[PDB]
């Protein structure tokens, strides 16, 4: 994933929370999906993914630690 500074469409929405972005806002693009910085985080701990690595379980994204604890 990569950090971007938003200057895109008014229709653009965060993949997680469905809210919009402000001009100039630092956001994350992961595989074409756009996220608020506070939204590209593990669903269990709410912290950033170490080295950007996440693991999906039923439509939510988890860090390695929480994925291994709960779902692996």
């Amino acid at each position: 994933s990569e950090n971007l500074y938003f200057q895109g469409s008014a229709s653009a929405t965060c993949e997680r929370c469905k809210g919009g972005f402000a001009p100039a806002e630092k956001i994350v693009n992961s595989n074409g999906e756009l996220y608020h910085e506070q939204c590209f985080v593990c669903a269990q701990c709410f912290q950033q993914f170490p080295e950007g690595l996440f693991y999906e379980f039923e439509g939510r994204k988890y860090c390695e630690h929480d994925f291994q604890m709960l779902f692996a």
Partner: protein, 168 residues
Amino acid sequence: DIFTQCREGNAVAVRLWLDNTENDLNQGDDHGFSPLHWACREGRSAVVEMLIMRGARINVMNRGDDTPLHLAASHGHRDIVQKLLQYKADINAVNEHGNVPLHYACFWGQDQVAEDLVANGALVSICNKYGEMPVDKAKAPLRELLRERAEKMGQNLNRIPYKDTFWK
């Protein structure tokens, strides 16, 4: 198995399994999810009521120290949250990250669950282990509303840093 039947809401199969008292209705699966955890997570209201009325322990914890009330709140199952509270679930139960059920209701925009939790006294100012209060996981409108509701319910809004018996 029982865990799949609870996830799916197969009430007759769950009832028959519970009828055999040699089965342990509190026993967790490979990650510590009890029948009650799965039924709460997946919104299976009839199965939740059956498990509770047949004696299931309400504050059981899975491998990440989540309770059934964390899962019901995280997944927006309002009726199940109310049933659990009625049967004495610990509303400020903490998981391994110091998160309470209100953190998840706020993070996932489960607005009616978050409001019900605060109406039942859930603390809004208690930081998790990384310094984040539950209401600060919410989007602004809900965040502001929950602090106002909490104040009107006689909460103190001072930030409370995380502490537990093993912290220091």
